[PDB]
Amino acid sequence: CSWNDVFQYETNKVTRIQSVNYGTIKWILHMTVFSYVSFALMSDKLYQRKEPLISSVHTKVKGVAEVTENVTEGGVTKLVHGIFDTADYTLPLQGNSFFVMTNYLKSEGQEQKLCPEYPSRGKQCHSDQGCIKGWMDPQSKGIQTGRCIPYDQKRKTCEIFAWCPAEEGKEAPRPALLRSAENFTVLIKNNIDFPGHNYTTRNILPGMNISCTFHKTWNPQCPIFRLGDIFQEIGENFTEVAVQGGIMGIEIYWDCNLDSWSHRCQPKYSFRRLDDKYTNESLFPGYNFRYAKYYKENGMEKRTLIKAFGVRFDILVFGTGGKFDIIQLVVYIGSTLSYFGLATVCIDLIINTYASTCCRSRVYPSCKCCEPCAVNEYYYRKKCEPIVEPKPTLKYVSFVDEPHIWMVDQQLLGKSLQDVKGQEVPRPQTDFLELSSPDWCQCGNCLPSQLPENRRALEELCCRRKPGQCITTSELFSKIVLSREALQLLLLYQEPLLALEGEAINSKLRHCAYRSYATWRFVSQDMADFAILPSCCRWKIRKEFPKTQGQYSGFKYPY
Amino acid sequence: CSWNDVFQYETNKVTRIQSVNYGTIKWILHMTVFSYVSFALMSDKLYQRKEPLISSVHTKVKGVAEVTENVTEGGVTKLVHGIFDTADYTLPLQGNSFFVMTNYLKSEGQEQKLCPEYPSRGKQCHSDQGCIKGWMDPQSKGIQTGRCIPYDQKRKTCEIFAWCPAEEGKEAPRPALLRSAENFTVLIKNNIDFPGHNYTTRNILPGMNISCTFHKTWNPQCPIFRLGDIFQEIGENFTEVAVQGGIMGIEIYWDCNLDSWSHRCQPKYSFRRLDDKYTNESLFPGYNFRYAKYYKENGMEKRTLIKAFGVRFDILVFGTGGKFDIIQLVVYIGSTLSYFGLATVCIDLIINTYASTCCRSRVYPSCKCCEPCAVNEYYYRKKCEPIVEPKPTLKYVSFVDEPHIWMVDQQLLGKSLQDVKGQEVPRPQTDFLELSSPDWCQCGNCLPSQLPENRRALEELCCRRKPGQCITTSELFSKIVLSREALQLLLLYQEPLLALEGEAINSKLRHCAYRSYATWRFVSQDMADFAILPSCCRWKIRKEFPKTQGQYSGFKYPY
Amino acid sequence: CSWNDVFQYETNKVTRIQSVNYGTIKWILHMTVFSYVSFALMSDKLYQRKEPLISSVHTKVKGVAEVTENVTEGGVTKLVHGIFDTADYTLPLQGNSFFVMTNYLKSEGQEQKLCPEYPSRGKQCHSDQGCIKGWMDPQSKGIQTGRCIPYDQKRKTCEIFAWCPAEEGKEAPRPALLRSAENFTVLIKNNIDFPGHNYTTRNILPGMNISCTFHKTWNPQCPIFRLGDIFQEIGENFTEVAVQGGIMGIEIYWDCNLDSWSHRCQPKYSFRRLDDKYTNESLFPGYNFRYAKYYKENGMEKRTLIKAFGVRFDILVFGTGGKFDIIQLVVYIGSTLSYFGLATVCIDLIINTYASTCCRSRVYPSCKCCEPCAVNEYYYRKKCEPIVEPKPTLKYVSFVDEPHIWMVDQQLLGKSLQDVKGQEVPRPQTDFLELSSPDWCQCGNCLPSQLPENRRALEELCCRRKPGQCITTSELFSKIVLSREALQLLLLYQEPLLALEGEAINSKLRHCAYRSYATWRFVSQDMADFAILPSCCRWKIRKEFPKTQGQYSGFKYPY
Ligand SMILES: Nc1nc2c(ncn2[C@@H]2O[C@H](COP(=O)(O)OP(=O)(O)O)[C@@H](O)[C@H]2O)c(=O)[nH]1
Ligand SMILES: Nc1nc2c(ncn2[C@@H]2O[C@H](COP(=O)(O)OP(=O)(O)O)[C@@H](O)[C@H]2O)c(=O)[nH]1
Ligand SMILES: Nc1nc2c(ncn2[C@@H]2O[C@H](COP(=O)(O)OP(=O)(O)O)[C@@H](O)[C@H]2O)c(=O)[nH]1
Ligand SMILES: [Zn+2]
Ligand SMILES: [Zn+2]
Ligand SMILES: [Zn+2]
Ligand SMILES: [Zn+2]
Ligand SMILES: [Zn+2]
Ligand SMILES: [Zn+2]
């Protein structure tokens, strides 16, 4: 608002404790924070801006296998010897995955025509009622025709229009026909980019030996892998997995630092099985798929249908490239700055916990080692300044016999303030730098109030809680309170040019006396504004400074 | 630096307000923060380290369809009945996407030779000038030859060397030939890994029924999906999309908790359309691609070119696997600790806002409900201690007639300090614990200065701003200021063994008197160092304690 | 614990400095923080919830090429003219990558039979010992048979069962046969989804011109790209890369804002080379793969094996879609709130640094510009209150001749407290508001102690460190310390109703005197509890208030 309020700055008040304990603890905690953050910075390279890589994988599988087996075509079974090369056991998959056929079931000479279903999964029909024309299910190799026909002697099945002879349902051959595929080799060419860092690298370095095969120990940087070795590394068996197939994962990790002084961008090759470790009791065990090779002889389309089992090798290339970036370093430092409140939190918790009072009587006798730590009480005394809410029902009373002040914050509701009991607030220590018979009356000098019957509950108070000498007869009472010269001097200190013979001057003196007593018994001003004078002292003060104007008022809210 | 400065610890000074309001508000806000953080922890499982999954998808589509249609080859059109099985309507795509052919346009008997362009997109030529030899465009089915030839009667087009007869440009057949593909079923085998958690699972559980088809309600865990059902789930129509094709997405979500007490790793299957919901008015509507089946009869290469329309089903497998990690829990707790400053911020804002002064005169009459909250002023009085910048131009003046002190921080530049007006700083309350005629002159006792003409602007001051009794004649002035015994006692309190008859002792006494007045009128010491004594009081003090040494000096900078 | 302790609230004590410097610096720093956070919010759109996109890419390549070359089949070499269209130079890859064949080496008429290895990589054998039956290596086109055979005159090689005639090992033809592929065009249909934002868009907009080809400047939104143009954009040469192949990346970026007032969702097309920029000296340079086309003539399976070189174009679609979210805005604001401690940190650092004392004597003479800034000392005086650890070995001593107090916190171990020297703590300023011959003896009035020989080291102290007048003879000593009336008044102020003739009253008076001296010389109470009185003053006090009970005790721990 105002211009003065604009250029103002708040800084917290603090207290510096000269304690070897706190200095030690604070520096230990600060050094622990600093050491941890430096270790994290120089281990996780949090000063480096890290960028993900753009990968490109190109794969080539080399190796040939020979398969000698009996094959049936045109109703004739013959022993055929065949050769499988890259073009024969690989699919033209161009990317991060390649497939090697380890086993196959091929049906040759297929022609679109009518034929019986092969009876492999309960496809047995005894009458045309068991076949629905145009019907199909997932196990159907064709579209059912309404009429049954005999597949062979002593066995009958539904007729279907399909590629015939229909695919016989037979399990994967054991041993795998292309188990020799464990000896095949795959070259993986992996090119990675960090655009932000403007860096490119490949998994193939100049001077590489072509007649190399990866080995984690002897040759961990040759990107030519034997498939059987890939399987042994984990513990898998290629010949067993070859029968029904599987999925293998080739992980190429690039933890690259592009800093010149610390430069290292090399691929780490790891192998995982991404298929279920299936057994003889497993649902959908393996990896198979059907493709067809189409041809035609004698002017009619035909196909060889191959159900291929094999291992699909998915290739997961991942990693990060780090290069020094001052923004990252500065941001990390800024984040870590907050960590250094550890010392303040810990030491302040100790100070507040060891200044709970309960610790002194109970904990110390049980444990004498933690005895002197009660010094924290001193530290809490200087650190904290308790302040009460100033409210109309707040009162303070003091009894000479009593040791301290009573905070009667509870509304009286007609009960005498003498009777009412409240919190026992300690009396503050004086500024020694300067020093250097009503039913509720125990003193006898208390006069009955003059307030309204409801209001007089507050003024019903005695200088002491038990019978004895009145505070009013104390010699110091006249010196401090009733001393006209002292009150006049105080007023002059306040208002040096006030009329000495004013009509209302007496009233002012009375107020001063109220303050004086409230300050003599309730040291703190905050505790002296809300104090309540006993009836005896109040009425002697009134006698010394009476008011002909009318009935004397009473305690009024300070604020 | 020094060893003492090493073991020092700063702890903020604080004030504890005994207020039911603040205790209540503080605990409400703390409980709200705590409840929110606990809810977030136990809902988002922020105590769990979450790891992304490595997925592997293997898909198998089963189902057959029959297509009866007129096909033209070698110039002969014949009604051909054909059967499409998995090997016929699927591409050998091995991964997260599979394609089902829903429609096709096949050109048979193609041979590399010369033939006319089919006139489908304005490929009309009337002379050889309209054809450019060797020319090609994206709509060209061949390489233009320079000479026109007649495609048929009453129509002519450019000659091309291409696969002939050239692909006729005709729109996707309606209805789709393989709309029966809505009845096909796809099995998705999904294997996921969490390496950090060392966990593997598959979307297929033991005891699964093979004769099952996914249903969100009856059977949400069968990984066999009917394609038509996939489309209905969203609202799409397979037969309509079958004509030109599309792209569908199968999302497999894995929200997995690997904690033993709370273990749940199941796939959630959802379906999305990744193609545009195209209509009769849409650019590039659908999904089609051309492949060829190559063969040869009579020792010459030929091909059947198939333009295939269908639905590509991309499969998006994503998810997270969570397992309890104490580091995550501790880090989250550490993050949440900062949230608990809500109470301090709110309550301190209330205290500072309700102690703005402007609130009292203006806001309270309008709203009497927010009347007692002025207690915050008290809380601001104890919390904050305003301190001014000590600067050479800083002065304070007090006038008996005036109620408080004036902070004249503006340089005089020759203007009398009496004339100059400045900020009205309130007079601090005394430590009652101890208590318990120049043109600018209104008093008449002010003597003209003796400073340089420029310097005397500061000393041009009167005890009061209006005519009246001088402060100097006040009885308390002699008691406090001019009282030789009092000043000697103060000096002894300072230096108990100072010479009582020293030559310069008078000067010391004078200084003491300056302090005494500055303390009698400007209570706070910080406000009494920079105070300026009126001419009358200063010159009476000089008269009581004169200096034969020479001309008296004046106010000098405290620091 | 107690109900009173529940409703308590701590608020830090603060001091508001009225400094134009701090107000200015604080507001400058606050405005810098606020401006930075607003700039970041409105640039990075940190008020927007950002969601990653789900992409779908469908690609179509159009263009034809003619290749005239000599081809060998069945032992006959003939000049063959061929045509390559989309079905001929593309693989049926359905996804984010497409392949265009730019070169090829095809071996025709292959039949499974026995044939010699082609001698291309040192496959020279002179006797059957150089061939191992059943042997295979990665360069083997077949399975070795034990017997050598002559490939041709004057050259011999191992026999193999393989597809024969065996693949001749010859390098990629130059120039590329399908270099015309630089003129081919690719249409990329890219459909993106933001599920959270429920937004879908495609890279193709209504009103697009089909006869368009992408251009960064003229036509940056046509998704039809000429491949040669893709290469020129970077700087690559299609005809050179066509020979052996490569990999290109097409990046489609979607920076989309879905806010209605600011709506922009358009694709940004960029091109990168994902292959190594290989040369004549590079390992595994290019991109090639082998596939086969299978057929049969005369009832025997045969194949044409094509080694295809080309460019695989991977398509990387990435981006984020932002929509206004109040949670994001509020969270970002909450994060930024902490940034506004910049002013407090900076100004408090200035205050603490410029109040180091060392700055005054050393820095100021060297630089007079930074002279008045010593005002920070004042600010440190009000801000910080040093407090020492109260410990049994803590003592304070004062010598009239000395200027301040000495903090002797070191255990004496028998050495006289007079001899022991310690820290020079300054004497605090008095509350002027109220003001307004042993060997170690230099005064002569010190009496030898009466403590145990070990304990008397503490009491061995003199009022002054050098010979001179004793403090005890000072007139103020009797007024303050020995004045019986003053001590009685103090005690009455403490206990107004204490017996005036009690047996132990003298002892109380003695204690009061100890306090009085400790307060006269050690102003601060904390520094006066641990003070040590000189022997002379202590023994005069004892003489005035002797104790017949027995030997006088000495300083005891305050707490
Ligand atoms: N602390 C305290 N103050 C009192 C007491 N009685 C009166 N006062 C103060 O005295 C001031 C005036 O009261 P008083 O002079 O007795 O009323 P009057 O006779 O009608 O003028 C009020 O502002 C009260 O705060 C008391 O018992 N304790
Ligand atoms: N606060 C205040 N201090 C003063 C004033 N005049 C003099 N002093 C102080 O008195 C001290 C000495 O001034 P003074 O004795 O009058 O000069 P001298 O006569 O030449 O020795 C200086 O350090 C001033 O701070 C005044 O009007 N106000
Ligand atoms: N600060 C201070 N206090 C003292 C010294 N000597 C005694 N006291 C205090 O006086 C109190 C009682 O000591 P004292 O009366 O001399 O012992 P007594 O004669 O046996 O009763 C103790 O609590 C001490 O703290 C002193 O040299 N310096
Ligand atoms: Zn009484
Ligand atoms: Zn009484
Ligand atoms: Zn005057
Ligand atoms: Zn005057
Ligand atoms: Zn002595
Ligand atoms: Zn002495």
ω into residue A223 within 30 of 0, thus cis?
no
Whole-number Cα distances in Å, C464 to A365, C253, C397, C400, C446? 43, 87, 10, 5, 11
Atom of ligand 3 minimally distant from the CA of C528: 1
3 state SS for A415-448: CCCCCCCCEEECCCCCCHHHHCCCCCCCCCCCCC
The C-alpha R_g of chain A, in whole angstroms, comes to 51
Could you say which DSSP state residue B479 is in? I
- In which element (H, E) is residue C529 found? helix C525-529
Per-position DSSP letters for B161-218, written without gaps between them: EEEES-----PPPSS-TTGGGGG-EEEEEEEEEETTTTEEEES--TT--SS---BTTT
Range B52-117+166-322 has CATH code 2.40.40.20: no
DSSP A279: -
A65 Cβ contact list (under 8 Å, min separation 6): A83, A84, A89, A177, A178, A180, A181, A184, C136, C143
- Residue pair C73/C303 in contact (Cβ under 8 Å)? The answer is no
Distance A442 CA to ligand 5 centre (A): 7
User: HSE on the CB side for A62, CA within 13 Å?
Assistant: 15
For ligand 3, say whether the CB of C532 is within 6 Å of any of its atoms: yes
Omega prior to C150 cis, within 30 of 0: no
Measure the CA–CA gap between B271 and B248, rounded to whole angstroms.
7
- In degrees and rounded to multiples of 5, residue C333 shows phi and psi of -60, -45
| Token code pair at residue B320 | 């997270």
Burial class (CB in 10 A: 0-12, 13-18, 19+), B76: exposed
Q: Phi-psi bin for B456: left (phi > 0), alpha (psi -120 to 50), beta? A: alpha
Ligand 7 center from residue B465 Cα (angstroms)? 10
Query: Across chain A, how many H-helices and E-strands are there?
Result: 16, 21
Distance between CA B439 and CA B395 in Å, rounded?
21
Tell me: is residue B185 an annotated ligand-binding position: yes
Rounded Cα gap, residues B551 and A549, in angstroms: 56
Identify the burial level of A464 via C-beta atoms within 10 angstroms of its C-beta, where 0-12 means exposed, 13-18 middle and 19 or more buried: buried
Q: Which of C101, C42, C123, C555 is nearest to C324 (CA)?
A: C42
Distance (Å, whole) CA C194 – CA C200? 6
How far is residue B400's CA from residue C38's CA, in Å, rounded to a whole number?
53
Q: Per the annotation, does B207 bind a ligand? A: no
Cα–Cα distance measured from residue B36 to residue B15, given in angstroms and rounded to the nearest whole number = 29
Rounded Cα gap, residues C135 and B243, in angstroms: 53
Please indicate if any CB of chain C lies within 8 Å of the CB of B494.
yes
Q: Which amino acid residue places its CA nearest to atom 5 of ligand 3?
A: C555
Closest protein CA for atom 28 of ligand 2: B532
For the four alpha carbons of A398, A430, A555 and B374, in that order, the dihedral sign comes to: negative
* C341 contact residues in B (CB cutoff 8 A): none
Residue A319 phi/psi, 5-degree rounding, is 160, 180
CA–CA distance, B97 with B246 (Å, rounded to integer): 13
What's the CA gap between A545 and A481, in Å, rounded? 11
Contacts 24+ apart (CB under 8 A), B108-111: B108/B71, B108/B72, B108/B73, B108/B304, B109/B73, B109/B74, B109/B165, B109/B302, B109/B304, B110/B163, B110/B164, B110/B165, B110/B292, B110/B302, B110/B303, B110/B304, B110/B305, B111/B163, B111/B164, B111/B300, B111/B301, B111/B302
Q: How do A48-52 and C54-62 pair as beta strands?
A: unpaired
Q: Is A12 exposed, middle or buried (0-12, 13-18, 19+ CB in 10 A)?
A: middle
Q: How far is the CA of C433 from the centre of ligand 7 (A)?
A: 23
Overall residue count recorded for chain A in this entry: 559
- Gaps in chain B (C to N over 2.5 angstroms) fall after 436
C-beta separation of C422 from C407 below 8 A: yes
Of B16, B295, B476, the CB nearest to A387: B16
Distance CA C339, CA C30 (A): 9
The DSSP secondary-structure symbol of B359 reads I
Please give the biggest Cα pair distance in chain B: 146
Closest atom of ligand 1 relative to the A510 alpha carbon: 15
Contact partners, residue C316, CB within 8 Å, separation at least 6: A54, C96, C249, C250, C251, C252
Q: How far apart are CA B409 and CA B422, in angstroms?
A: 7
- The nearest CA of chain C is from the CA of B211 a distance in Å of 30
Q: In whole angstroms, what is the distance from residue B180 CA to residue A161 CA? A: 15
HEC readout, C394-436:
CEEEECCCCCCEEEECCCCCCCCCCCCCCEEECCCCCCHHHHC
Q: How far is A92 from chain B (nearest CA, A)?
A: 9
Strand partners, A113: A162
Token pair for C121: 């990589």
Give the count of beta carbons closer than 10 Å to the beta carbon of residue A549: 10
User: Are the Cβ atoms of A64 and C379 closer than 8 angstroms?
Assistant: no
Nearest atom in ligand 1 to the alpha carbon of residue A538 is 27
Amino acid (1-letter code) at residue B138: P
Task: Answer whether A474 touches C (CB < 8 Å).
Answer: yes
Distance A428 CA to ligand 4 centre (A): 24
Nearest CB neighbour to B496, from listed C358, C386, C471: C471
Question: Any alpha helices (H) in A312-363, and if so which ranges?
Answer: 326-337, 342-353, 358
SS3 C233: helix
Separation CA C396–CA C518 (nearest Å) = 10
Query: Mapping DSSP to helix (H, G, I), strand (E, B) and coil, where does residue B524 land?
Result: coil
Q: Is A20 on the interface with B (CB under 8 A)?
A: yes
Place of tokens 């069945």: C74
Task: Give exposure, A256-293, as e/b (b: 16+ Cβ within 10 Å).
Answer: bbbeeeeeebebebebbbbbbebeeeeebbbbbbbbbb
Of C63, C86, C479, Cβ closest to residue B290: C86
Give the per-residue SS3 of B111-126: EEEEEECCCCCCCCCC
**Dist. CA B62–CA C347, nearest whole Å:** 76
Report DSSP state, residue B459. H
> CATH 1.10.10.10: does it fit domain A52-95+177-303+310-323?
no
Q: Per CATH, is C52-106+174-323 categorized as 2.60.490.10?
A: yes
Which residue has the least CA distance to atom 17 on ligand 1? A553
Q: Which of C119, C170, C113 is nearest to C142 (CA)?
A: C113
CA–CA gap between residue C490 and residue C494 (Å, rounded)? 6
How distant, in Å, are the alpha carbons of C405, C444, C495, C554 from that of C439? Answer: 22, 10, 41, 20
In angstroms, rounded to a whole number, what is the distance separating the alpha carbons of residues A106 and A308? 8
Q: Give the ligand at the shortest distance from the Cα of A442.
A: 4
Tell me the three-class secondary structure of C301-357, residue by residue. Answer: EEEEEEEEEEEEEEEEEEEEEEEECHHHHHHHHHHHHHHHHHHHHHHHHHHHHCCCC
**DSSP code string of B24-50:** HHHHHHHHHHHHHHHHHHHHTTTTEEE
List chain A residues with CB under 8 Å of C17. 8-11
Tokens of A118: 């092969």
Nearest one of C471, C457, C462, C463 to C440, comparing CA atoms? C462
DSSP structure class, residue C215: B
Distance between B465 CA and the closest CA of chain C, angstroms: 24
Contacts of A254 (CB under 8 A, 6+ apart): A53, A192, A201, A265, A266, A267, A268, A317, A318, A319, A320, A321
- In angstroms, what is the span from residue C535 Cα to ligand 8's centroid? 7
Residue A497 dihedral angles phi and psi, to the nearest 5°? -115, 45
CA–CA separation, A340 and A331 (whole Å):
16
Question: Which of C398, C555, C557 to mutate for ligand 3's pocket (most ligand atoms within 8 Å of CB)?
Answer: C555
Interface residue B451 vs chain A (CB under 8 A): no
Any known ligand binding at B19? no
Structural biology method used: cryo-EM
Report the alpha-carbon distance of residue B522 to residue B516 in Å, rounded: 10
CB A385 to CB C13 under 8 A? yes
What DSSP line would sit under C258-299, residue for residue? E-SSSEE--EEEEEEE-S----SS-SS-S-EEEEEEEEESSS
Structure tokens belonging to residue C366: 């060297």
Place of tokens 């890290």: A50
Chain A CB contacts of C299 under 8 Å are 297
As to burial, measured by CB atoms within 10 angstroms (0-12 exposed, 13-18 middle, 19+ buried), residue C31 is exposed
Of B11, B92, B436, the CB nearest to A347: B11
**In angstroms, what separates the C-alpha of A220 from chain C's closest C-alpha?**
18
Give me the residues near ligand 9 (ion), CB cutoff below 5 Å.
Answer: C 443, 445, 463, 470, 472, 536
**C-beta of residue B417 within 8 angstroms of C-beta of residue B457:** yes
DSSP letter at C122 equals: S
- Report how far residue A293's alpha carbon sits from residue C298's, in angstroms, rounded to the nearest whole number: 17
Give the residue carrying structure tokens 């104090």.
A531
> Could you tell me the sign of the dihedral formed by the alpha carbons of B297, B298, B302, B304, in that order?
negative
- Among A9, A227, A464, the strongest candidate for a mutation testing the C interface, having the largest count of C CBs within 10 A, is A9
Which atom, in ligand 2's list, is nearest to the CA of B552?
Answer: 19
Which of A530, A532, B376, B16 is closest to C4 using CA atoms? Answer: B16
* C511 close to ligand 3 (CB < 6 Angstrom): yes
Residue B87: list chain A partners with CB under 8 A.
290-292, 303, 305
Surface-to-core class of residue B160, CB atoms within 10 Å of its CB (0-12 exposed, 13-18 middle, 19+ buried): buried
Q: What are phi and psi of B303, to 5 degrees?
A: -150, 150
Quick one: chain C helix, strand, coil %, rounded to 5? Answer: 30, 30, 40
**Which residue among A64, A384, A434 places its CB closest to the CB of C162?**
A64
Under 8 Å between Cβ of B89 and B310: yes
Residues 332-351 of B with CB under 8 A from C: 343-344, 347-348, 351
Q: Does A3 touch chain B (CB under 8 A)?
A: no
Alpha-carbon separation of residue A469 from A10, A543, C488 (angstroms): 52, 20, 18
Q: What is the DSSP letter of A179?
A: G
Domain segments of chain A as ranges: 20-45+327-383, 52-95+177-303+310-323, 395-544
User: What token pair was written down for A141?
Assistant: 């190799």
CA of C492 from ligand 1 middle (Å) equals 25
Beta bridge partners of C51: C321
Q: Which amino acid is at B134?
A: G
